[PDB]
Every structure is written in structure tokens, then in C-alpha cells.
Amino acid sequence: GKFGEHLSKSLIRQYSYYYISYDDLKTELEDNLSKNNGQWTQELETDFLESLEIELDKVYTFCKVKHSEVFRRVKEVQEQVQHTVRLLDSNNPPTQLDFEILEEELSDIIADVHDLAKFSRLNYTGFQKIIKKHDKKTGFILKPVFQVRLDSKPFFKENYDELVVKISQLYDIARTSGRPNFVRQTTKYWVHPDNITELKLIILKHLPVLVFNTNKEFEREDSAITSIYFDNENLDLYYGRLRKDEGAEAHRLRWYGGMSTDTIFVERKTHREDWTGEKSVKARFALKERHVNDFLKGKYTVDQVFAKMRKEGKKPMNEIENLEALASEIQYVMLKKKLRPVVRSFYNRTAFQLPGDARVRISLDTELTMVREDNFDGVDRTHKNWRRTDIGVDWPFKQLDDKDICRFPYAVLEVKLQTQLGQEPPEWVRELVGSHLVEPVPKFSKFIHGVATLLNDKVDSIP
């Protein structure tokens, strides 16, 4: 009534005529009743139902025009945006200037959808308010009669749910300026044993030494990386890795820290030639030391190996089945190729990294040593074991015969960068790498070096 006409004055500026004539209908109700001394008739009702059907048809059609008009701008931009995306890969590319315009046009449609929605709703509220006022002031029933007429001609039933979702989808393309990060680097350097400490102290200031929670304080023992490499009498695996053969496997049994360590890593490296397009892999499974000799024989089955892991329930069966397939393959090769402990690789690793920072990550391998594990010269070193027991991690292994050990003259410094595009690596790294402490050099194999050095007499190809 009064609150309905006062709020009606808050209509959209541009559209004043297209809007409901509430005042004109409120006058028709009060003027006809005053004339008939507060009484409504069959004649007055049919004439008032005419006025309402005139305004309903006026609104329904305008809204059927503006609805198609705003849907036109949508079709036009949906098309232009879909073609812009196609042009991202083609010879003619779309610059950032293009997306700025597309966004500008969407913002304009957003304004229109808003105005269309505000109008449809304001009008429907008016019709509801006028029918409610008529049925009150007269004893005539018009609410369910007129509802049939409103439902047959809906402008208010517009969901906009799909339009809004589409506008956001299109706007996101303009926001993401198309269809929608750093650079890695790994360098190895030789370090002369005179600089191991100086270099360690330098790195220390910037990056802390990575210490694993060893259930006890640090001991030199805790940095030892011992790896027993396997090959046969004919040194098949060595030649394969040496000639960089496609699919060339290298088998090694690794343990971290001192002799107290019971968890042994059964590792395998598969070489993949660049022509395949596939990268080389490294795969491993953990094994208790008390089971190693028995496993390599075939006596300790793969199903026995992983029985505890299956029962533990921590790992998904898919992963377990892959680890089982791995162990099975490693077990097959050891037997079929008659592999035996051939050469031991030892070195101490000091890692340097800031927690949750990968911009710079350094590692230093020191006391690089290759020891004989074979029986190719008649001398049984292992004594039917997977490693010799006359040595531990007790470098420089003085007890060993001079011809069984190769104490490598240098240390290896590995610098792993992850530099975000546009930015540079820290100046401290650039200064260190360019200093008298490190020498530039490419990666080498401790297995190949060990076999070629210690088994010089057995090998024909020496790099």
C-alpha cells in the first residue's frame, strides 16, 4: 500500500516507464469503490483484471527482450573468449591488451544482469502487493486467479544460476590471462682434502648441517654411507654401465651409519638412454641384516620379506605390490646372473639445508673409498657373506691390503639450486663456487672407478 509505493520510488534510474504502474492501480481500486459506496461488483472486477493483464503482458515482454539482450552480450563474449583461447597456441597470439578488454566487457554484462534481476524482482513484488491489497479492500478473490496468469508468463522465475556460473568462468579466463614455478640446477665440484674443513665452516654460517634424530647425539659413524656393489665373474654389470647400455642395471646393498645399523637398503639403478626419452631410475626396498644372506640365496622369499609391511597396514597395497615386484626382479637377477659382492663404496656425507628452503641445498662427500669384496684373485674376502667383516666404517681401513683399497684423492661438493624465475641464486653461493676451494667437474661412477682400479688385471676397458 503506502510502504509499497514509497519503496517503488527506489526503481532503476534508466527504466521508469517499463516499470509497474502501482499508483495507477491503487487509484483504480479507491476511485471505483468511492463511486459505489465501498462496494465491488462483477463489472469492476473484470475491468480491474483487464488493467492487471495489461501491466503483466507489458512486464513479461520487456523482460523477454532485456533477457535476450543481456544473453546476446553473453553469447558474444562466450564466443570471443573461446576463440582467444584457440589463438594461444597458433601463429597469431593474444597479448595482455586483449584480455583487459574482454574483462571490461564482462564487468559491463555483470552490471546488466544485476539491473535485469533487480527489475524482474521489484515488479513481481509489486504485482504480489497489489493483488493482496485488492483482495483485502474488496471481498473478491484474485490471488489464485492471477497466479495462474503470472505462472503462464514468468519473468520472475529466471534462475540466473547458470548465467552467473558462466560469467564467472569467462571472467576467470580474463583474470588468469589465458588457459591457466622455478628452475633447477645440480653441479658437482672436486674439493681438495685441505679445504674440507674451511669449506664446511663457510657453508655452516648460511646453511645448517642436516642431522637426523639418531636417538643419541652425533658421532662420526652417523655420516657413513657404505654400499656393497654386486657383479659376476665375467663383470657383466660393469661393462653395461661402462658402455652406458640401455636398461643397464647396477645392484648395491647400502647401509647408513655404523655397524650397529640393521636396516639394509637393497638398491638398483636402471640406466635409460636419452633416445628412449625416459629418465634413469633408482629403486630400493629395506631389509633386516639377519635376512640378507638368506634372501640373496633365494631361501628368504619376497612374500616373507614384505609380510610385516602387509600386516602393518601403513602402506597402500598398490605400493607394496610394486616393492614386491622390485624385490622379485632383484632376487631373479642375483641368481640368474650369479652376482656376488664385488666392490664396496664408502664415503662420509655432510648435508646442508635450511628447513623448508630449497633455494640452495649443499652436500659434501668425503673420504671416498673403494674396497674389494670379490674372490676373483682366489682370496675369499666375504667368506660366503654379503660383505667383509674384517672392516666396518673405520676409515682409512689401515688393516686392509694396499691392493684391496683405493682411497680417492678428492671430496665431492654437490650444489642443488631451485631458483625462482627472474631472481638470481644467493651471492654467497656464486662467490664460493667461483673460489679456490672448489674445482669444476662432471659426475663419475664409484662402481666403475672401483672395478677399473682394484680389478685392473680383470678388466679390458679402463676410462
Side-chain angles (χ1 to χ4, degrees), residues 407-442 444-451:
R407 302 174 193 87
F408 194 84
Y410 296 93
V412 192
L413 189 87
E414 185 185 60
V415 189
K416 296 145 287 175
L417 301 183
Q418 279 182 208
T419 305
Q420 223 82 33
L421 275 148
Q423 218 63 71
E424 282 175 67
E427 193 51 43
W428 75 261
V429 201
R430 296 231 78 200
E431 277 199 283
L432 188 61
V433 155
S435 83
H436 58 89
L437 297 151
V438 301
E439 301 175 68
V441 93
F444 87 119
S445 155
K446 286 157 198 181
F447 174 53
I448 292 155
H449 189 266
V451 175

Short mmCIF file of all heavy atoms in Angstrom, two decimals, residues 407-451, unseen atoms left out:
data_model
loop_
_atom_site.label_atom_id
_atom_site.label_comp_id
_atom_site.label_asym_id
_atom_site.label_seq_id
_atom_site.Cartn_x
_atom_site.Cartn_y
_atom_site.Cartn_z
N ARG A 407 91.87 -45.24 -1.72
CA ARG A 407 91.45 -44.02 -1.02
C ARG A 407 91.51 -42.86 -2.03
O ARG A 407 92.59 -42.35 -2.31
CB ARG A 407 92.30 -43.75 0.23
CG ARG A 407 92.28 -44.88 1.26
CD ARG A 407 93.24 -44.68 2.44
NE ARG A 407 93.38 -45.92 3.20
CZ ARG A 407 94.26 -46.88 2.93
NH1 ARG A 407 95.13 -46.72 1.93
NH2 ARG A 407 94.29 -47.99 3.65
N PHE A 408 90.35 -42.49 -2.61
CA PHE A 408 90.19 -41.44 -3.61
C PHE A 408 90.73 -40.08 -3.12
O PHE A 408 90.43 -39.66 -1.99
CB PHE A 408 88.73 -41.36 -4.06
CG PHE A 408 88.48 -40.54 -5.30
CD1 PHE A 408 88.65 -41.10 -6.56
CD2 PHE A 408 88.06 -39.23 -5.21
CE1 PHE A 408 88.42 -40.34 -7.71
CE2 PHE A 408 87.82 -38.47 -6.35
CZ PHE A 408 88.00 -39.03 -7.60
N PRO A 409 91.58 -39.43 -3.94
CA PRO A 409 92.24 -38.18 -3.52
C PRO A 409 91.38 -36.94 -3.26
O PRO A 409 91.89 -36.01 -2.65
CB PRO A 409 93.20 -37.89 -4.67
CG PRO A 409 92.53 -38.53 -5.87
CD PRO A 409 92.03 -39.82 -5.29
N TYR A 410 90.14 -36.89 -3.77
CA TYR A 410 89.29 -35.71 -3.60
C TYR A 410 87.97 -35.99 -2.94
O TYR A 410 87.58 -37.14 -2.77
CB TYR A 410 89.05 -35.02 -4.95
CG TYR A 410 90.30 -34.47 -5.59
CD1 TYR A 410 91.02 -35.23 -6.50
CD2 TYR A 410 90.73 -33.18 -5.32
CE1 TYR A 410 92.16 -34.72 -7.12
CE2 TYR A 410 91.88 -32.67 -5.92
CZ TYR A 410 92.59 -33.44 -6.82
OH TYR A 410 93.71 -32.94 -7.43
N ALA A 411 87.28 -34.89 -2.56
CA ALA A 411 85.95 -34.89 -1.95
C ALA A 411 84.95 -34.33 -2.97
O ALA A 411 85.35 -33.61 -3.90
CB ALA A 411 85.96 -34.05 -0.69
N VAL A 412 83.66 -34.67 -2.84
CA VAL A 412 82.69 -34.18 -3.81
C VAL A 412 81.72 -33.22 -3.17
O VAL A 412 81.00 -33.60 -2.24
CB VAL A 412 81.92 -35.28 -4.61
CG1 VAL A 412 81.16 -34.67 -5.79
CG2 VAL A 412 82.85 -36.40 -5.06
N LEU A 413 81.66 -32.00 -3.72
CA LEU A 413 80.70 -30.99 -3.28
C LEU A 413 79.59 -30.89 -4.33
O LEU A 413 79.88 -30.59 -5.49
CB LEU A 413 81.35 -29.61 -3.05
CG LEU A 413 80.43 -28.59 -2.38
CD1 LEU A 413 80.50 -28.71 -0.87
CD2 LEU A 413 80.72 -27.19 -2.85
N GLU A 414 78.34 -31.16 -3.91
CA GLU A 414 77.18 -31.05 -4.78
C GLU A 414 76.31 -29.88 -4.34
O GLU A 414 75.83 -29.85 -3.20
CB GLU A 414 76.36 -32.35 -4.79
CG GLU A 414 75.20 -32.33 -5.78
CD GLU A 414 74.29 -33.55 -5.73
OE1 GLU A 414 73.70 -33.81 -4.66
OE2 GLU A 414 74.18 -34.25 -6.77
N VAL A 415 76.09 -28.93 -5.26
CA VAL A 415 75.24 -27.76 -5.02
C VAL A 415 73.95 -27.91 -5.86
O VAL A 415 74.01 -27.97 -7.09
CB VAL A 415 75.95 -26.41 -5.29
CG1 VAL A 415 75.09 -25.24 -4.81
CG2 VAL A 415 77.33 -26.36 -4.64
N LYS A 416 72.80 -27.99 -5.17
CA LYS A 416 71.48 -28.12 -5.79
C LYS A 416 70.70 -26.83 -5.60
O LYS A 416 70.29 -26.48 -4.48
CB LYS A 416 70.70 -29.33 -5.23
CG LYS A 416 71.32 -30.70 -5.51
CD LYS A 416 71.10 -31.68 -4.33
CE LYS A 416 71.96 -31.38 -3.10
NZ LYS A 416 71.65 -32.27 -1.95
N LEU A 417 70.49 -26.11 -6.71
CA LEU A 417 69.73 -24.87 -6.75
C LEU A 417 68.31 -25.12 -7.26
O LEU A 417 68.06 -26.08 -8.00
CB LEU A 417 70.41 -23.82 -7.65
CG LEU A 417 71.84 -23.38 -7.29
CD1 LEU A 417 72.30 -22.29 -8.23
CD2 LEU A 417 71.96 -22.92 -5.85
N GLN A 418 67.39 -24.27 -6.80
CA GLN A 418 65.98 -24.16 -7.17
C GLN A 418 65.73 -22.66 -7.14
O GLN A 418 65.39 -22.09 -6.09
CB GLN A 418 65.07 -24.94 -6.20
CG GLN A 418 65.01 -26.44 -6.49
CD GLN A 418 64.08 -27.22 -5.58
OE1 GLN A 418 64.30 -28.41 -5.33
NE2 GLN A 418 63.02 -26.59 -5.09
N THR A 419 66.03 -22.00 -8.26
CA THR A 419 65.95 -20.56 -8.43
C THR A 419 64.66 -20.15 -9.14
O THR A 419 64.45 -20.55 -10.30
CB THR A 419 67.24 -20.03 -9.10
OG1 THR A 419 68.37 -20.45 -8.32
CG2 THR A 419 67.26 -18.51 -9.24
N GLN A 420 63.81 -19.36 -8.45
CA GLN A 420 62.56 -18.82 -8.98
C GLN A 420 62.90 -17.86 -10.11
O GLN A 420 63.83 -17.07 -9.96
CB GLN A 420 61.75 -18.11 -7.89
CG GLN A 420 60.25 -18.43 -7.90
CD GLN A 420 59.88 -19.74 -7.22
OE1 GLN A 420 60.50 -20.17 -6.24
NE2 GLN A 420 58.81 -20.36 -7.70
N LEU A 421 62.18 -17.98 -11.25
CA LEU A 421 62.39 -17.17 -12.45
C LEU A 421 62.38 -15.67 -12.19
O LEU A 421 61.58 -15.18 -11.39
CB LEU A 421 61.39 -17.55 -13.55
CG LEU A 421 61.80 -18.74 -14.43
CD1 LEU A 421 60.58 -19.52 -14.89
CD2 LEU A 421 62.63 -18.28 -15.61
N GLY A 422 63.33 -14.97 -12.81
CA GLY A 422 63.52 -13.53 -12.65
C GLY A 422 64.56 -13.21 -11.59
O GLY A 422 65.32 -12.25 -11.74
N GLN A 423 64.59 -14.03 -10.52
CA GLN A 423 65.53 -13.94 -9.40
C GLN A 423 66.87 -14.65 -9.71
O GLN A 423 66.97 -15.41 -10.67
CB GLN A 423 64.86 -14.49 -8.12
CG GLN A 423 65.20 -13.72 -6.83
CD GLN A 423 64.72 -12.29 -6.84
OE1 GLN A 423 63.52 -12.00 -6.74
NE2 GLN A 423 65.65 -11.35 -6.93
N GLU A 424 67.90 -14.35 -8.90
CA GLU A 424 69.25 -14.89 -9.02
C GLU A 424 69.59 -15.81 -7.83
O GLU A 424 68.97 -15.67 -6.78
CB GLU A 424 70.25 -13.73 -9.03
CG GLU A 424 70.35 -12.99 -10.34
CD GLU A 424 71.26 -11.78 -10.27
OE1 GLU A 424 72.48 -11.96 -10.09
OE2 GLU A 424 70.73 -10.64 -10.35
N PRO A 425 70.61 -16.71 -7.93
CA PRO A 425 70.99 -17.50 -6.75
C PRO A 425 71.75 -16.60 -5.76
O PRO A 425 72.32 -15.59 -6.20
CB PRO A 425 71.91 -18.60 -7.31
CG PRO A 425 71.97 -18.39 -8.78
CD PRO A 425 71.51 -17.01 -9.06
N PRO A 426 71.77 -16.92 -4.44
CA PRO A 426 72.47 -16.05 -3.48
C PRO A 426 73.93 -15.79 -3.83
O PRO A 426 74.60 -16.68 -4.34
CB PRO A 426 72.33 -16.81 -2.16
CG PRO A 426 71.12 -17.63 -2.32
CD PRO A 426 71.13 -18.05 -3.75
N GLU A 427 74.40 -14.55 -3.58
CA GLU A 427 75.77 -14.15 -3.91
C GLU A 427 76.82 -14.99 -3.19
O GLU A 427 77.88 -15.24 -3.77
CB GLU A 427 75.98 -12.63 -3.68
CG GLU A 427 77.26 -12.05 -4.27
CD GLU A 427 77.59 -12.33 -5.73
OE1 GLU A 427 76.67 -12.24 -6.58
OE2 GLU A 427 78.77 -12.61 -6.03
N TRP A 428 76.50 -15.49 -1.97
CA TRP A 428 77.42 -16.34 -1.20
C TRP A 428 77.76 -17.64 -1.92
O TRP A 428 78.89 -18.12 -1.80
CB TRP A 428 76.89 -16.57 0.22
CG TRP A 428 75.76 -17.55 0.35
CD1 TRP A 428 74.44 -17.25 0.47
CD2 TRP A 428 75.87 -18.97 0.51
NE1 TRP A 428 73.71 -18.41 0.63
CE2 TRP A 428 74.57 -19.48 0.68
CE3 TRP A 428 76.95 -19.87 0.49
CZ2 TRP A 428 74.31 -20.84 0.84
CZ3 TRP A 428 76.69 -21.23 0.63
CH2 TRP A 428 75.38 -21.70 0.81
N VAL A 429 76.78 -18.20 -2.65
CA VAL A 429 76.93 -19.44 -3.42
C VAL A 429 77.79 -19.14 -4.64
O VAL A 429 78.77 -19.85 -4.86
CB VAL A 429 75.59 -20.08 -3.84
CG1 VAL A 429 75.77 -21.55 -4.17
CG2 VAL A 429 74.53 -19.91 -2.76
N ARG A 430 77.46 -18.06 -5.39
CA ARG A 430 78.21 -17.62 -6.58
C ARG A 430 79.69 -17.36 -6.23
O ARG A 430 80.57 -17.76 -7.00
CB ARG A 430 77.56 -16.39 -7.25
CG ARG A 430 76.15 -16.61 -7.83
CD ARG A 430 76.01 -16.15 -9.28
NE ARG A 430 76.60 -17.12 -10.23
CZ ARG A 430 76.96 -16.84 -11.48
NH1 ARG A 430 76.81 -15.61 -11.96
NH2 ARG A 430 77.49 -17.78 -12.25
N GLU A 431 79.95 -16.75 -5.06
CA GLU A 431 81.29 -16.44 -4.58
C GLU A 431 82.10 -17.68 -4.18
O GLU A 431 83.31 -17.73 -4.44
CB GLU A 431 81.22 -15.46 -3.41
CG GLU A 431 81.09 -14.01 -3.82
CD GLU A 431 81.49 -13.05 -2.71
OE1 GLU A 431 80.68 -12.86 -1.77
OE2 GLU A 431 82.62 -12.52 -2.77
N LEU A 432 81.43 -18.67 -3.53
CA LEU A 432 82.01 -19.92 -3.05
C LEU A 432 82.46 -20.81 -4.20
O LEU A 432 83.61 -21.23 -4.26
CB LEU A 432 80.97 -20.68 -2.19
CG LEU A 432 81.43 -21.94 -1.44
CD1 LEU A 432 82.54 -21.62 -0.45
CD2 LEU A 432 80.26 -22.59 -0.73
N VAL A 433 81.52 -21.08 -5.12
CA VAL A 433 81.66 -21.86 -6.34
C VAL A 433 82.79 -21.30 -7.24
O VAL A 433 83.50 -22.06 -7.89
CB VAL A 433 80.28 -21.89 -7.03
CG1 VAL A 433 80.37 -22.11 -8.54
CG2 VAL A 433 79.37 -22.93 -6.38
N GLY A 434 82.95 -19.97 -7.24
CA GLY A 434 83.99 -19.30 -8.01
C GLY A 434 85.32 -19.18 -7.29
O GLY A 434 86.28 -18.65 -7.86
N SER A 435 85.40 -19.68 -6.04
CA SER A 435 86.61 -19.60 -5.22
C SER A 435 87.61 -20.75 -5.43
O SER A 435 87.29 -21.75 -6.09
CB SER A 435 86.25 -19.46 -3.74
OG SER A 435 85.97 -20.72 -3.15
N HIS A 436 88.80 -20.60 -4.83
CA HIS A 436 89.94 -21.53 -4.83
C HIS A 436 89.64 -22.85 -4.08
O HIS A 436 90.48 -23.76 -4.13
CB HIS A 436 91.15 -20.84 -4.19
CG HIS A 436 90.89 -20.38 -2.79
ND1 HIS A 436 91.12 -21.21 -1.70
CD2 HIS A 436 90.37 -19.21 -2.34
CE1 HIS A 436 90.76 -20.51 -0.63
NE2 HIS A 436 90.30 -19.30 -0.97
N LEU A 437 88.49 -22.92 -3.37
CA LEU A 437 88.08 -24.08 -2.56
C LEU A 437 87.54 -25.22 -3.40
O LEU A 437 87.86 -26.38 -3.13
CB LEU A 437 87.04 -23.68 -1.50
CG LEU A 437 87.50 -22.70 -0.45
CD1 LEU A 437 86.34 -21.89 0.04
CD2 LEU A 437 88.19 -23.40 0.70
N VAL A 438 86.73 -24.89 -4.41
CA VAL A 438 86.12 -25.86 -5.32
C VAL A 438 86.71 -25.77 -6.74
O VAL A 438 87.16 -24.70 -7.15
CB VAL A 438 84.57 -25.81 -5.31
CG1 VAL A 438 84.02 -26.07 -3.92
CG2 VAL A 438 84.05 -24.49 -5.85
N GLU A 439 86.69 -26.91 -7.45
CA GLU A 439 87.15 -27.11 -8.83
C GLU A 439 85.96 -27.64 -9.67
O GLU A 439 85.31 -28.59 -9.22
CB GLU A 439 88.30 -28.13 -8.88
CG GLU A 439 89.53 -27.76 -8.07
CD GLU A 439 90.59 -28.84 -8.02
OE1 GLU A 439 91.22 -29.11 -9.08
OE2 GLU A 439 90.80 -29.43 -6.94
N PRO A 440 85.65 -27.10 -10.86
CA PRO A 440 84.50 -27.63 -11.63
C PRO A 440 84.76 -29.01 -12.27
O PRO A 440 85.84 -29.20 -12.85
CB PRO A 440 84.25 -26.55 -12.68
CG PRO A 440 85.59 -25.90 -12.88
CD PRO A 440 86.32 -25.98 -11.56
N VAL A 441 83.78 -29.96 -12.16
CA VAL A 441 83.94 -31.33 -12.71
C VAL A 441 82.59 -32.12 -12.92
O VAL A 441 81.65 -31.92 -12.14
CB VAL A 441 84.94 -32.15 -11.84
CG1 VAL A 441 84.24 -32.95 -10.73
CG2 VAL A 441 85.82 -33.04 -12.71
N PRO A 442 82.48 -33.06 -13.91
CA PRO A 442 81.22 -33.81 -14.05
C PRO A 442 81.19 -35.10 -13.22
O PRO A 442 82.26 -35.66 -12.92
CB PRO A 442 81.16 -34.12 -15.55
CG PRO A 442 82.59 -34.15 -15.99
CD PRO A 442 83.44 -33.45 -14.96
N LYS A 443 79.98 -35.57 -12.87
CA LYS A 443 79.75 -36.80 -12.09
C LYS A 443 80.44 -38.05 -12.70
O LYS A 443 80.55 -38.19 -13.93
CB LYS A 443 78.24 -37.04 -11.90
N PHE A 444 80.94 -38.93 -11.81
CA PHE A 444 81.64 -40.18 -12.15
C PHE A 444 81.00 -41.32 -11.33
O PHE A 444 80.29 -41.04 -10.36
CB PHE A 444 83.16 -40.04 -11.86
CG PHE A 444 83.65 -40.36 -10.46
CD1 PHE A 444 84.56 -41.39 -10.25
CD2 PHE A 444 83.22 -39.62 -9.37
CE1 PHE A 444 85.01 -41.69 -8.96
CE2 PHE A 444 83.65 -39.93 -8.08
CZ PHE A 444 84.55 -40.96 -7.88
N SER A 445 81.24 -42.58 -11.72
CA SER A 445 80.69 -43.73 -11.01
C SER A 445 81.71 -44.32 -10.06
O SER A 445 82.83 -44.62 -10.46
CB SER A 445 80.20 -44.78 -12.00
OG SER A 445 80.19 -46.10 -11.46
N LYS A 446 81.31 -44.50 -8.79
CA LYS A 446 82.15 -45.10 -7.77
C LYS A 446 82.32 -46.62 -8.03
O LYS A 446 83.37 -47.18 -7.73
CB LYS A 446 81.59 -44.81 -6.37
CG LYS A 446 81.82 -43.35 -5.94
CD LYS A 446 80.85 -42.83 -4.87
CE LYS A 446 80.89 -41.32 -4.85
NZ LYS A 446 79.99 -40.73 -3.82
N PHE A 447 81.31 -47.25 -8.67
CA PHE A 447 81.32 -48.66 -9.04
C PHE A 447 82.36 -48.90 -10.13
O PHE A 447 83.27 -49.72 -9.94
CB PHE A 447 79.92 -49.09 -9.52
CG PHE A 447 79.76 -50.49 -10.08
CD1 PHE A 447 80.19 -51.60 -9.36
CD2 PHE A 447 79.10 -50.70 -11.28
CE1 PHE A 447 80.00 -52.89 -9.85
CE2 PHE A 447 78.90 -51.99 -11.77
CZ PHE A 447 79.35 -53.07 -11.06
N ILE A 448 82.24 -48.17 -11.26
CA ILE A 448 83.16 -48.26 -12.40
C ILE A 448 84.59 -47.90 -11.94
O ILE A 448 85.49 -48.71 -12.13
CB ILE A 448 82.64 -47.44 -13.62
CG1 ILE A 448 81.37 -48.10 -14.19
CG2 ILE A 448 83.70 -47.31 -14.71
CD1 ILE A 448 80.45 -47.18 -14.94
N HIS A 449 84.78 -46.76 -11.24
CA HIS A 449 86.11 -46.39 -10.74
C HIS A 449 86.72 -47.49 -9.88
O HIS A 449 87.88 -47.84 -10.10
CB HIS A 449 86.10 -45.07 -9.99
CG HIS A 449 87.47 -44.57 -9.65
ND1 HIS A 449 88.07 -44.85 -8.43
CD2 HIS A 449 88.34 -43.86 -10.40
CE1 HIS A 449 89.26 -44.27 -8.46
NE2 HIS A 449 89.47 -43.66 -9.62
N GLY A 450 85.93 -48.05 -8.96
CA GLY A 450 86.36 -49.13 -8.08
C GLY A 450 86.79 -50.38 -8.81
O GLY A 450 87.86 -50.91 -8.53
N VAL A 451 85.97 -50.86 -9.76
CA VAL A 451 86.27 -52.07 -10.54
C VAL A 451 87.49 -51.87 -11.42
O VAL A 451 88.38 -52.70 -11.42
CB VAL A 451 85.03 -52.59 -11.31
CG1 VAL A 451 85.38 -53.77 -12.21
CG2 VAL A 451 83.90 -52.97 -10.36
#
